[PDB]
Amino acid sequence: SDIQMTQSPSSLSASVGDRVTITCRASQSVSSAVAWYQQKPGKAPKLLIYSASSLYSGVPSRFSGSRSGTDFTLTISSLQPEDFATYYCQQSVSYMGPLTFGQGTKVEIKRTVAAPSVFIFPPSDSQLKSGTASVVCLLNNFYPREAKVQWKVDNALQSGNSQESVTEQDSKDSTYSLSSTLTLSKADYEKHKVYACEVTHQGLSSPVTKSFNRG
Amino acid sequence: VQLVESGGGLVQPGGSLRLSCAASGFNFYSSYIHWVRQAPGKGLEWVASISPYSGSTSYADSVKGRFTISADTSKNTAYLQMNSLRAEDTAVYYCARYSWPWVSYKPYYGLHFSAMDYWGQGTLVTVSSASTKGPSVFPLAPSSKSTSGGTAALGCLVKDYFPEPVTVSWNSGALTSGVHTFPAVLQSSGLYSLSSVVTVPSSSLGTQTYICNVNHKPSNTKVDKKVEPKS
């Protein structure tokens, strides 16, 4: 007798000022026992709407909820940059019974294209004592999230020895930043001179390369 | 109103942990207290509920028989005793509440339902046989070529630690402009790494000092690393 909450879409990208509608279908009647939460990465969810359509105190009036039978909707009438989040529906129709959540909808703020600023960092002498060298390339404050980082060592393309991390979308300017870390042994690091990261991004007229010479 | 979770940490598979949820600022006796967890990268999953006034409890099938939820109204505190832990129990555990009543009826109209208005910040439970390892902190030194008045970047690389989490601040929290602390990545080695960077005026280099403050509570580690231009 599990109640499934089927939330759609799982992800969407929309512009500031757009109307956004998220839907949640319950697999059986949940009466009006549906709440909607907003969660920023790494933070507790925050209540937006309770009992299907009541706006929780302090929540902006651009958020609203509706029920039609077993179909529930959360609408954001005019999306704002701070509305980037994952949104979840949750039912509580069974008293002291199972509470079930939708799978979440990740809302990204679409904005105009912005090219990254690029920086490269050599490994520290402190790290080299340990036998490994990390070389880091930073792509700062860009949109959209898609980017290509290609590492070159003495103009030879690298593959398989790098890992990327991307920040969550900025709540104010809606941009991303990205790090790429190239990991090599100290011995291999000392066999080569020119370390370069080449960045391709749609906001750039052509790829941007930053480099250093070991030493 | 506040809820504060405690007790999370690293625990071996098959082991046990007791989480606590300390409540303040509301009628704990009348509320309903819930534990809701979030596995890394995954959604919210309800675990258990209790009504402190009566002692009644409820559990998700995934945890029945292994977890016990309880409450002490004398101390306004709820607890989750987790036994026979599995890797699938690794998650951030939140405590949250309903105000009484769970559901009310308006005659000749409908039902009206409570929701989770207050949540704690969450406590991380990591179920693993791997051992705790403290981070090594390395400078990401600003370039010499940040010339004549543009923008420079500098940072700290926080490498090879376990379990999560690490937190990073700059100048003990006084510097937030332009700071980006990246999500940790799991390396193939099984250890985590992350970087934190900040952009500053190129003119500020050489006259300003920048300290990255790294905290890895699982290893009781606090490192304050000064990040300088390399001479």
Q: Last residue of some domain: A110, A129, A156?
A: A110
Q: Last residue of some domain: B100, B127, B154?
A: B127
Smallest CA–CA distance, residue A24 to chain B, in Å, is: 15
In the Cβ-directed half-sphere of A115, how many Cα atoms lie within 13 Å?
12
Residue B103 contacts A, CB cutoff 8 Å: yes
Token readout for A141 is 């404050």
Same domain, A141 and A195: yes
Q: Which residues pair with B3 in a beta bridge?
A: B23
Task: Specify the resolution in Å.
Answer: 1.1
How far is it, in rounded angstroms, from Cα B168 to Cα B106? Answer: 51
Token readout for B86 is 């599995």
Cβ–Cβ below 8 Å for A88 and B139 = no
Which one-letter DSSP state was computed for residue A41? T
Q: Which of B44, B109, B160 to mutate to test binding with chain A, by most A CBs within 10 Å of its CB?
A: B44
Q: Which residues pair with B129 in a beta bridge?
A: none
Find residues 172-201 of chain B whose CB sits inside 8 Å of chain A: 180-185, 187, 193-195, 197, 199
Domain that holds residue B201: 136-227
Which residues in chain B touch residue A37, judged by CB atoms under 8 angstroms apart? Answer: 44, 116
Please choose, from the candidates B110, B150, B169, the residue with its C-alpha nearest in 3D space to the C-alpha of residue A53.
B110
**What CATH number is given to the structural domain containing A138?**
2.60.40.10
How far is it, in rounded angstroms, from Cα A199 to Cα A201? Answer: 6
CB nearest to B117's CB, from A47, A102, A120: A47
Domain that holds residue A166: 117-213
Same domain, A103 and A127: no
Residue A163 contacts B, CB cutoff 8 Å: yes
Cβ–Cβ below 8 Å for B141 and A122 = yes
Same domain, A9 and A105: yes
Same domain, B106 and B162: no
Question: Is the peptide bond prior to B163 cis by the omega test (within 30 degrees of 0)?
Answer: yes
What is the tally of structural domains in chain A?
2
* Other beta carbons within 10 Å of B44: 25
Q: Which residues pair with A162 in a beta bridge?
A: A182
Please choose, from the candidates A130, A59, A49, A42, the residue with its C-alpha nearest in 3D space to the C-alpha of residue A91.
A49
B204: helix, coil or strand?
A: helix
B217: helix, coil or strand?
A: helix
